[PDB]
Design an enzyme around this catalytic site. Structure first.
Site, mmCIF file in Angstrom:
data_model
loop_
_atom_site.group_PDB
_atom_site.id
_atom_site.type_symbol
_atom_site.label_atom_id
_atom_site.label_comp_id
_atom_site.label_asym_id
_atom_site.label_seq_id
_atom_site.Cartn_x
_atom_site.Cartn_y
_atom_site.Cartn_z
ATOM 1 C CE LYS A 13 -3.904 2.218 2.399
ATOM 2 N NZ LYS A 13 -4.754 2.495 1.205
ATOM 3 N N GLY A 14 0.939 1.948 -1.131
ATOM 4 C CA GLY A 14 1.720 3.167 -1.260
ATOM 5 C C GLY A 14 0.850 4.401 -1.221
ATOM 6 N N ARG A 15 1.374 5.521 -1.733
ATOM 7 C CA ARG A 15 0.635 6.782 -1.763
ATOM 8 C C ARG A 15 -0.457 6.796 -2.848
ATOM 9 C CG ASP A 134 9.232 7.432 -5.256
ATOM 10 O OD1 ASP A 134 9.903 7.951 -4.329
ATOM 11 O OD2 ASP A 134 8.159 6.816 -5.068
HETATM 12 N N1 LIG Z 1 4.994 -7.289 -8.459
HETATM 13 C C1 LIG Z 1 4.991 -7.182 -7.138
HETATM 14 N N2 LIG Z 1 5.237 -8.291 -6.395
HETATM 15 C C2 LIG Z 1 5.274 -8.179 -5.060
HETATM 16 N N3 LIG Z 1 5.096 -7.080 -4.311
HETATM 17 C C3 LIG Z 1 4.841 -6.005 -5.076
HETATM 18 C C4 LIG Z 1 4.786 -5.967 -6.457
HETATM 19 N N4 LIG Z 1 4.572 -4.673 -6.907
HETATM 20 C C5 LIG Z 1 4.494 -3.972 -5.800
HETATM 21 N N5 LIG Z 1 4.636 -4.720 -4.654
HETATM 22 C C6 LIG Z 1 4.560 -4.277 -3.255
HETATM 23 O O1 LIG Z 1 3.582 -3.253 -3.144
HETATM 24 C C7 LIG Z 1 4.195 -2.053 -2.631
HETATM 25 C C8 LIG Z 1 3.503 -0.835 -3.197
HETATM 26 O O2 LIG Z 1 3.657 -0.839 -4.657
HETATM 27 P P1 LIG Z 1 4.030 0.416 -5.555
HETATM 28 O O3 LIG Z 1 4.123 -0.045 -6.966
HETATM 29 O O4 LIG Z 1 5.296 0.949 -4.938
HETATM 30 O O5 LIG Z 1 2.837 1.430 -5.173
HETATM 31 P P2 LIG Z 1 2.757 2.994 -4.792
HETATM 32 O O6 LIG Z 1 1.461 3.411 -4.282
HETATM 33 O O7 LIG Z 1 2.931 3.805 -6.048
HETATM 34 N N6 LIG Z 1 4.012 3.403 -3.773
HETATM 35 P P3 LIG Z 1 4.843 4.870 -3.541
HETATM 36 O O8 LIG Z 1 4.722 5.830 -4.630
HETATM 37 O O9 LIG Z 1 6.292 4.519 -3.392
HETATM 38 O O10 LIG Z 1 4.327 5.546 -2.242
HETATM 39 C C9 LIG Z 1 5.673 -2.219 -2.967
HETATM 40 O O11 LIG Z 1 6.453 -1.398 -2.118
HETATM 41 C C10 LIG Z 1 5.882 -3.706 -2.704
HETATM 42 O O12 LIG Z 1 6.002 -3.979 -1.308
HETATM 43 MG MG LIG Z 2 6.246 2.643 -4.273
HETATM 44 MG MG LIG Z 3 4.603 5.124 -6.434
#
Ligand SMILES: Nc1ncnc2c1ncn2[C@@H]1O[C@H](COP(=O)(O)OP(=O)(O)NP(=O)(O)O)[C@@H](O)[C@H]1O
Ligand SMILES: [Mg+2]
Ligand SMILES: [Mg+2]
Length: 298
Positions: A13-15, A134
């Site tokens: 779960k990211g932003r 990022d």
């Molecule tokens: N293909 C994958 N396999 C396993 N875990 C994954 C995968 N893609 C993402 N994750 C997990 O999910 C998290 C969140 O995904 P992410 O693609 O970074 O989303 P986000 O909302 O854009 N994050 P951020 O911008 O850094 O605040 C990652 O930090 C991993 O822990």
């Molecule tokens: Mg991320």
């Molecule tokens: Mg991101």
């Protein structure tokens, strides 16, 4: 037209999104789900993943992008390969890695960034350079073979010649404050040269390489994992507190002299120290770093 997917578990779960481990009736896949409000983030990543020139072993493998109706509206999905070992930050928190693991993670990280940055395909054809913007250990996935792959392209920028300096100016400071380059924290970037954005990625990569090194048993005594500047700033640091450390105090994560007794660690530490230089022009390119890691035969 929608794929037969069943959501199993929330893994990230990211932003911008939620990531779920799921099944495709490969069976196990990852599903990045964005609400309608985060459509721009989904579309930015989908555009990056859709480019035929992006495909690389050190870049997360994309399957498809979908639009799914729900009772409360609509959701936007990105379906990719699932990496069971999860993100690099969680992996370094649980494990102490070997020298062989450090060489593999470090070189695969540099190779992936060098591929994004490149103005040409391996076969010599022109391609649009991409700056991640990022880079951090939570945006890196650990593959089963203990190599890296870059994920999360939501803030990434395609270095298009049509980009306006005023259109880049705000935007503003994009990324995660903890990993922002000193020139990003200073708002001192030259919004002209293409290499200037690539240089900010190299500084972030240097902090990531420090995180990997800090957990490598080849240093001797290994401390508990801590993110860069963990002992200086709060959990979600602001840009002002980061500027105070990285810029005003010229602060960088600590490299104890005992780490340098191993020849490989010493070379890695010299490489990353150059990459986190205050002056973006003094930093090595991601291609140089990948070349230095390939030289690590003995
Ligand atoms: N293909 C994958 N396999 C396993 N875990 C994954 C995968 N893609 C993402 N994750 C997990 O999910 C998290 C969140 O995904 P992410 O693609 O970074 O989303 P986000 O909302 O854009 N994050 P951020 O911008 O850094 O605040 C990652 O930090 C991993 O822990
Ligand atoms: Mg991320
Ligand atoms: Mg991101």
């Amino acid at each position: 037209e929608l794929l037969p997917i069943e959501l199993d578990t929330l893994v990230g779960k990211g932003r911008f999104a939620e990531v779920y481990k799921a099944k495709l009736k490969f069976e196990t896949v990852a599903v990045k789900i964005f609400p309608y409000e985060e459509y721009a983030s989904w579309k930015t990543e989908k555009d990056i993943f859709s480019d035929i020139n992006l495909k690389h072993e050190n870049i997360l493998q994309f399957l498809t992008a979908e639009e799914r109706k729900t009772e409360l509206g609509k959701q936007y999905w990105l379906i990719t390969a699932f990496h069971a070992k999860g993100n690099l930050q969680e992996y370094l928190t649980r494990h102490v890695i070997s020298w062989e693991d450090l060489r593999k993670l470090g070189s695969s990280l540099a190779r992936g960034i060098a591929h994004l940055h490149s103005d040409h395909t391996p076969c010599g054809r022109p391609k649009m350079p991409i700056v991640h913007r990022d880079l951090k250990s939570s945006n890196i996935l650990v593959k089963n073979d203990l190599t890296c792959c870059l994920c999360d392209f939501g803030l990434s920028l395609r270095l298009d010649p049509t980009l306006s300096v005023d259109d880049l100016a705000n935007s503003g400071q994009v990324g995660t404050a903890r990993y922002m380059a000193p020139e990003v924290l200073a708002s001192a970037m030259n919004l002209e040269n293409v290499e200037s954005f690539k240089q900010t990625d190299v500084y972030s990569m240097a902090l990531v390489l420090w995180e990997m090194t800090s957990r490598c048993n080849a240093v001797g005594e290994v401390k508990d994992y801590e993110p860069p500047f963990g002992s200086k700033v709060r959990e979600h640091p602001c840009v002002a507190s980061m500027a105070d450390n990285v810029l005003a105090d010229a602060g960088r994560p600590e490299i104890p002299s005992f780490w340098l007794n191993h020849q490989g660690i010493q070379m890695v530490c010299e490489t990353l120290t150059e990459c986190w230089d205050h002056d973006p022009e003094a930093r090595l390119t991601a291609q140089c770093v990948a070349e230095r890691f390939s030289e690590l035969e003995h």
